[PDB]
C-alpha cells in the first residue's frame, strides 16, 4: 500500500486532510479493500454491519452512486477520500451542497417531495423509527410534508439548492 507522491499531494490539496491523514486513510482503505476499488456489495456490507436488522439496501445504493463520481461501479481511493473530506469536514454549506446532490435523484436541479421521501425512507428503513403512539406515528411522509413545505418558500413543489441550504439556518 504505497501511494505515489504526486497522487498524495494532489489529494491533500483537494481535501481537508493533511498529507499524513491521506496516507493513513489509504493504508486503512487498502487494508479493507486490497484491490483499491470498493464495490456496491462491499459498501452495503458496511451498513448491514452497522444495522444488521434494518434494510440498508436503498440508502447504500443512493450514497454509493453519488460517491462513484465517474460511474464505473467502483469507489476508488480518490473518490473515497474526496467523499470523506466533504461529508466529514465540509462547511455546513458544502455538506448541504453534497446532500443536495444525493437528494436530487434525477439530477434535474431540484428536490421534489418524492425524492425527499425516498432518501428519508431509505434512512428509516436502515436505522429504524422512533416509537410513538399510533396517532402521532413517526412516518417519513408526515415528516417530509412538514419539512418540504417549510423549505419551499415559493410553494412551486420543488426545492432549489438555495431553498434547501436555508432549511436549518437561522435568520
Amino acid at each position: 500500500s504505497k501511494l505515489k507522491p504526486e497522487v498524495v499531494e494532489e489529494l491533500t490539496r483537494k481535501t481537508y486532510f493533511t498529507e499524513k491523514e491521506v496516507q493513513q486513510w489509504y493504508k486503512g482503505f487498502i487494508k479493507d479493500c486490497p484491490s483499491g476499488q470498493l464495490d456496491a456489495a462491499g459498501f452495503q456490507k458496511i451498513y448491514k454491519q452497522f444495522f444488521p436488522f434494518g434494510d440498508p439496501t436503498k440508502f447504500a445504493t443512493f450514497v454509493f452512486n453519488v460517491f462513484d463520481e465517474n460511474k464505473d461501479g467502483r469507489i476508488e481511493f480518490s473518490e473515497f477520500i474526496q467523499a470523506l473530506s466533504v461529508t466529514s469536514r465540509g462547511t455546513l454549506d458544502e455538506k448541504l451542497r453534497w446532500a443536495f446532490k444525493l437528494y436530487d435523484l434525477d439530477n434535474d436541479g431540484y428536490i421534489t417531495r418524492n425524492e425527499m421521501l425516498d432518501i428519508v425512507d431509505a434512512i428509516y428503513q436502515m436505522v429504524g423509527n422512533t416509537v410513538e403512539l399510533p396517532e402521532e406515528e413517526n412516518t417519513p411522509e408526515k415528516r417530509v410534508d412538514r419539512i418540504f413545505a417549510m423549505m419551499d418558500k415559493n410553494a412551486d413543489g420543488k426545492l432549489t439548492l438555495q431553498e434547501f441550504q436555508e432549511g436549518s439556518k437561522a435568520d
Binding site: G42, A99, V144
Partner: peptide
Amino acid sequence: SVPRFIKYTGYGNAAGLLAARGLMAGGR
C-alpha cells in the same frame, strides 16, 4: 433518547453523517 442527529433527517445533515460514518468504517 432519540439519536441526537436524526432530528436533521430530511435536512441533509443525517444522510451526510451516515455517509461519512460508512466511509470511515470502510477505511478502518
